[model samples]
Target: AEKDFCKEYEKQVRNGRLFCTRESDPVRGPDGRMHGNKCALCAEIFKRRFSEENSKTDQNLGKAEEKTK
Candidate 1:
């Protein structure tokens, strides 16, 4: 079935409050910080890709490859 993935992953407040449930092991983000999981990993990537100019953002990280490229 074409089930919910990223959309469902975005929802928080499963137990009683609004917070990420920590779906999986912490993973390194493009920002060089440990994020909650793969879901958060993409979230982190998304933020880094757009928050600043495409070239400038990824360039500082290490390589020139970018989300758009």
Candidate 2:
């Protein structure tokens, strides 16, 4: 009746900064900006890696569809 926990955390998991601690002098990532904590840094990597995986998986599914052609 309220909300799902995973979706809420997934927002944090995807968008990041849900667990800020120190970070007023945090690490500057490759994007020329910094994050509040480590979780923020990791999400950038995860999103890029998995987004590529999803595209590759889509191409594989395209190959499967070629079985009919």
Candidate 3:
């Protein structure tokens, strides 16, 4: 699980979702402490993990299987 977590984060980083950009400023908290930008990938994973909605099936059922598998 730990290794998988690292793998997932790395995959997201490579896909330009986890790391911050030049315009992605660090947030200043009410206490005046700066925090990193809200990670796009982290937010996505959190939503998928905690969402109450049923998982949606992929629309590209055949093409993805043909190309990737």
Candidate 4:
């Protein structure tokens, strides 16, 4: 299905709460952080954006080299 994977992941809750928790708090990642630890949705978005930018830069470099040679 064409569901919003990120939003779907975000919308997942536990029990009757609006989010999943571990014992006394929200589920923490391996980084010892909780509630959107180092791998927050926003962080993932940034990662995607940065990766696109890097590929774009590489493409531009290739064009420049082609033009020079």
Candidate 5:
């Protein structure tokens, strides 16, 4: 279900000189088709405007949950 880490960003920001995972988590809503979710980086025009918050819990952005209950 996953691939090489190098396939991600050119370089890693956390570990240093490593290829970081550029792909957004599946739960964050498809990378391209964003729907006003947290991981929707494309939703933000300016990169600086987005938050690097890495909270990945069900309450945050972990498992894929139904939008409407």
Candidate 6:
């Protein structure tokens, strides 16, 4: 099924009130620092964007290598 990311992400009340509140709250980790769960949809979008930028970086590196060669 096609996921409507915008709609799903926009459904947060005061941000993370709906599906993310309980899970997304910051917790004290073993390192004694606050570790937080991000909104599920936000994580998805971030991963997608990060993957895209990583590919671009890889491509740029390849181009640079070719120029150096």
Best by TM-score: 2
Candidate 4 residue lDDT tens string, 9-38: 345533422332232233443333235532
Tens-place lDDT digits, model 5, residues 1-69: 222222233234344333224454433324432333322433332132223332232343432345321
lDDT of 1 by residue, 1-69 (tens): 101333454464344222334555454556333354455554554465445644564564434446333
Model 3 CA deviation exceeding 4 Å by range: 1-38, 52-69
Every model's Cα RMSD, please?
10.0, 8.8, 12.0, 10.4, 12.5, 9.0
Candidates ranked by lDDT: 1, 6, 2, 3, 4, 5
Which candidate do you rate higher for TM-score, 1 or 3? Answer: 1
lDDT of 2 by residue, 1-69 (tens): 001322343465534433423432356664322354444444444465456664454564444477523
For model 5, the stretches where C-alpha displacement exceeds 4 angstroms are: 15-22, 27-69
Task: Give the TM-score of each candidate.
Answer: 0.30, 0.39, 0.22, 0.27, 0.15, 0.29
Per-residue CA lDDT of candidate 6, range 1-69, in tens?
Answer: 113432454475354342443534443433211244434445454456556665564664554577634
Candidate with maximal lDDT:
1
Error of 3 at 65 (Å): 40
Preferred candidate (lDDT higher): 2 or 4: 2
Per-candidate total of colliding backbone pairs? 0, 0, 0, 0, 1, 0
Ranking by TM-score: 2, 1, 6, 4, 3, 5
Off by over 4 Å in 6: 1-38, 56-69
What overall lDDT goes with each candidate model?
0.45, 0.43, 0.42, 0.39, 0.32, 0.44
The regions of model 1 sitting more than 4 angstroms off are: 1-25, 30-34, 54-69
Worst 10 residues of 3 by lDDT: 25-34
Model 2 worst lDDT window (10 residues): 1-10
Model 5 residue 32 CA deviation (Å) reads 21
